[PDB]
Amino acid sequence: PRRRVIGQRKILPDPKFGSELLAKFVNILMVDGKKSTAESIVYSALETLAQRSGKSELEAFEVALENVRPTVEVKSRRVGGSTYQVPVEVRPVRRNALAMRWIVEAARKRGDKSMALRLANELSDAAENKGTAVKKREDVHRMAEANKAFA
Amino acid sequence: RKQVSDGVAHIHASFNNTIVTITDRQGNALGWATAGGSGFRGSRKSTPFAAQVAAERCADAVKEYGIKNLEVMVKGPGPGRESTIRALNAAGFRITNITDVTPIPHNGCRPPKKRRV
Amino acid sequence: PVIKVRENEPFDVALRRFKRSCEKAGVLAEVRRREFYEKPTTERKRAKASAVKRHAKKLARENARRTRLY
RNA sequence: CGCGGGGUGGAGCAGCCGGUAGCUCGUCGGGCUCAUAACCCGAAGGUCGUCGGUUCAAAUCCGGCCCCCGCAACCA
RNA sequence: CGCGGGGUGGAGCAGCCGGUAGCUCGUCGGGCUCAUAACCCGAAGGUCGUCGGUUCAAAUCCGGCCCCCGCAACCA
RNA sequence: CUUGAGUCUCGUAGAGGGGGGUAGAAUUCCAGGUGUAGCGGUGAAAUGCGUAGAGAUCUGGAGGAAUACCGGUGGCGAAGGCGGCCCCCUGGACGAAGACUGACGCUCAGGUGCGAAAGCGUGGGGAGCAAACAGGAUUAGAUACCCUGGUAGUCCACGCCGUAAACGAUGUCGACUUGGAGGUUGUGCCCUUGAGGCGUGGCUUCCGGAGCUAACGCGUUAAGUCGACCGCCUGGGGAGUACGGCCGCAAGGUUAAAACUCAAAUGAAUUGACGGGGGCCCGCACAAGCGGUGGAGCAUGUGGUUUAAUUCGAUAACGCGA
RNA sequence: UGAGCCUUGAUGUGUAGGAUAGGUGGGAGGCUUUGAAGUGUGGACGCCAGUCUGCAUGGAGCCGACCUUGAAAUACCACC
């Protein structure tokens, strides 16, 4: 907004593991204010992922995230007659959220049956550096690279 | 090809496009590169970044001449004036002279007419 | 703006010196003025108007300065 | 009839040794874009005219056939 | 009469081999637009003058007729 | 007679004028070397130039035009105008003292001359730029703006043209009326004890007093206070046009009406509103996000059409009065 | 600067692999004081693994069917 920046509101960590990032992820996943279901889904996926990849639940989730975080994004300035995309370094708070949102969109898109299972597959892909979220991440990077001249 | 230790970089810096040309000290060009040729078009090649990468390309080109010392002559107004020379430096030559080599008439020829925009 | 790098001189410093020399020369400005043709009337008009602006800036604001703002 | 060029991904131009199987525009997806063309990423389209053979590498070297060229000569 | 051009979607200009059936403005819907024209998307309008035939491809190659052109010649 | 006007003496500064030389930079082209795929251009493109070697880069040559810096609300000129250096011819201005002439002055209808740019004629020249023209864009269209080219012309010589917002939109000459801050160019004195101190002349930029002015503003360079002479104005359009004359190669210039027509037309300033003017600031205004509407079926209101009637109203109206 | 030729030298990665296998026939040991393996490198090619080769040093050994393979040794060989 124009006038005042405001402090971000408080977020509680999730009951199972006691973490803020996961709570944010479940929030992102949720729909229609239905939290209990969304967090159950998140837990189910997590369990499947842990089974697949070994490591802790959390650690695996974090790894998967790392593989879809963007260093740089682009924004439209357009000072000229035609529009110019300008890269910008994306801040720590934002990048994490973007990766989450990206994972969740991929899960929505996938063709598997259960939501939790789809999310799980998406996380596995991110860990392996395939899937959908990684592609979109790549595309973002690629656009930035193309418009690197602008800075 | 004959190796040469010392030579020139000519930096033709226009508003629309930068041209880097490495030559020997006598005048004979060794290699050249351009922002337009570096894969930059329109808005993108009229930029310092385009110019520096063109400079980098030119430097790469004259690797086989094993040039070490270099003096630079900067021509024209443009973005690729400081950026280019920085890029050249980075490429790892001993920069010896920096000269400005813009053609300034002493009120000779009539320039073309002012644009109406 | 001919320049020679001194012995054990940093590159960046040298670049800065060159930039300063160019600024002093007014080469870029020179170029800018010669890009296309200025009508004599236009040149006269610019010069005069600039002088008028300078004089305003010198005297009227001084007068204003005498009085305090708050 | 004889003699030189050779025959391809929707069209075209594909790196002397047979192991590389392409690039432009084109259609679709997306991203940007006010728009469009542009730009970026990725994707479907093969026989290498054909019949065979030297060889694990073959369309890629050779024997024949069908065409596209180019030849220059002929014609009672 | 004889000889060259050919005959279309409301008007016009439609890619040598007969299998492509069009584009402009025009009318309607909508979207934007302060407005309008513009811009974008989509939509109704055919016979291909006609009678036939070579052929599964025909208006698309041919035989005749009706017109539109253009011809250049004629006229007691 | 000497105050006005002029001459003589010595200096001063000046892009003042005319002629003739010359310098350097830069553009263009030519010839050649190096070298390799782009260059160029724009908001973005494309036309255009490029592998027949461009662009870039170096060497040599040709030619034309103009003179960076100095350079300045600096200077000179009646105005137009005048800008690299040199030389030749040449006009004016100012100051310093003296000496002389002795009203010789001011203004000026007709008249005469000079008079930017464009334009015309004849002969030269032709780098760059560029009306016209051509192509590429943009656009609904784009006979424009932008891009790529490009001829008259711009340059020189000699003639003509005689007009410009040829403006300070302010005729010329003279006298008088408070001030400040400068610039420039002289000149007198002063210990120049230092770039200074005190004067006194010329030209010149800005601010401002009295006064003047419709106001804006002008204000010792008047638009103040007065005198001399001239030029010009008499509502807007029609019209600086027609006819006629004079001039001109022509383009056209100059002189200059009438009918008819309207009740305005104008100037300055004021308050608003507006601006694809400028500054500062705000709002789910955008941006960042989440969920919708627009497609489907149904509900509901409206438009329309239909009807005997489809009640009337609302149209920031349309689940509204209801 | 192009381009032939008597000649004597070099050149040749399917994957199986000692690793830069052109093919046929005569063949089981060719070279080594008109100087063998190991070292120093000058110039070439290159699929970056290496290969041929000059000069110096060294002075008494490296390479064979091998294990594999459609085809076996550049152990000598002539034809191209």
Side-chain angles (χ1 to χ4, degrees):
Chain A
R2 309 186 168 291
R3 153 70 51 193
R4 324 155 192 78
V5 70
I6 56 164
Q8 77 293 333
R9 59 166 51 78
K10 179 68 172 65
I11 190 166
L12 178 64
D14 64 321
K16 170 58 209 67
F17 291 168
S19 171
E20 299 79 1
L21 187 153
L22 292 70
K24 181 72 176 179
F25 181 75
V26 309
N27 276 359
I28 290 161
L29 197 79
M30 221 174 296
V31 65
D32 291 331
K34 178 64 189 161
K35 193 134 87 168
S36 177
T37 296
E39 64 180 14
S40 310
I41 301 299
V42 164
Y43 184 112
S44 178
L46 183 63
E47 179 268 319
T48 49
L49 276 298
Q51 184 36 59
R52 283 176 181 181
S53 301
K55 325 157 185 174
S56 183
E57 281 81 49
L58 294 174
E59 189 64 29
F61 194 20
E62 196 283 323
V63 166
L65 182 61
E66 182 53 37
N67 281 25
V68 288
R69 284 171 202 173
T71 60
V72 174
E73 63 95 16
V74 293
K75 67 202 305 196
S76 303
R77 179 103 160 181
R78 192 253 304 155
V79 294
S82 300
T83 306
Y84 292 164
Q85 299 280 53
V86 308
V88 68
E89 199 71 35
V90 298
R91 69 188 190 274
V93 189
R94 176 157 168 77
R95 64 195 295 99
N96 186 353
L98 315 173
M100 295 297 101
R101 195 192 301 156
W102 293 353
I103 288 151
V104 176
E105 61 85 20
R108 312 327 282 269
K109 298 298 293 295
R110 204 170 201 87
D112 292 293
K113 291 189 166 151
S114 184
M115 181 45 148
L117 289 173
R118 300 158 66 85
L119 188 153
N121 291 16
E122 182 63 25
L123 294 174
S124 190
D125 291 331
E128 201 270 354
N129 285 315
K130 70 189 196 296
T132 300
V134 304
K135 273 69 167 182
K136 57 184 310 312
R137 193 218 48 183
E138 281 286 343
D139 291 331
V140 184
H141 290 92
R142 181 132 39 69
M143 295 298 102
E145 298 291 330
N147 296 115
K148 188 175 172 192
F150 263 50
Chain B
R1 293 139 303 299
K2 183 37 53 201
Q3 278 272 330
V4 65
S5 185
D6 61 329
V8 167
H10 296 283
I11 301 299
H12 183 136
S14 84
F15 304 131
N16 289 333
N17 184 38
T18 61
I19 301 299
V20 54
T21 289
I22 301 299
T23 179
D24 66 348
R25 188 178 294 274
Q26 319 317 315
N28 300 269
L30 319 181
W32 60 263
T34 80
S38 305
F40 294 74
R41 191 261 200 165
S43 298
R44 184 170 58 110
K45 62 152 173 172
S46 54
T47 79
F49 176 88
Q52 62 180 4
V53 302
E56 288 166 22
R57 209 150 310 288
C58 203
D60 298 327
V62 290
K63 67 180 72 64
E64 300 321 327
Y65 286 81
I67 313 172
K68 278 69 67 177
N69 293 20
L70 294 175
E71 69 276 16
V72 182
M73 283 73 74
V74 183
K75 302 161 293 323
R81 220 159 174 286
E82 171 46 279
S83 65
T84 52
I85 192 66
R86 181 57 66 55
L88 183 63
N89 183 0
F93 293 105
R94 281 84 69 193
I95 194 51
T96 300
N97 290 318
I98 299 169
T99 307
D100 178 350
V101 293
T102 56
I104 68 186
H106 306 307
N107 289 321
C109 276
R110 185 177 178 178
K113 72 196 202 180
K114 300 289 94 176
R115 297 172 87 246
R116 294 194 286 286
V117 183
Chain C
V2 176
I3 290 174
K4 177 70 174 67
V5 58
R6 298 194 264 266
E7 191 274 333
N8 288 320
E9 187 173 18
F11 275 72
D12 62 358
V13 169
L15 316 193
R16 195 173 287 103
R17 296 184 289 109
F18 193 100
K19 296 184 289 293
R20 154 69 174 177
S21 192
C22 298
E23 293 179 353
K24 291 174 70 176
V27 180
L28 282 294
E30 174 69 24
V31 171
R32 275 147 190 58
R33 59 179 181 85
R34 300 171 174 285
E35 306 315 347
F36 322 131
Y37 180 68
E38 183 177 1
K39 185 176 180 179
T41 65
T42 305
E43 182 65 26
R44 284 198 286 280
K45 184 180 176 67
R46 279 213 300 100
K48 182 67 180 294
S50 185
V52 185
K53 181 267 290 181
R54 278 186 285 272
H55 185 93
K57 179 271 294 179
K58 190 186 288 296
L59 281 291
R61 57 91 174 173
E62 195 195 326
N63 194 11
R65 189 268 293 165
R66 282 83 168 96
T67 55
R68 65 163 171 176
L69 301 201
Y70 55 84

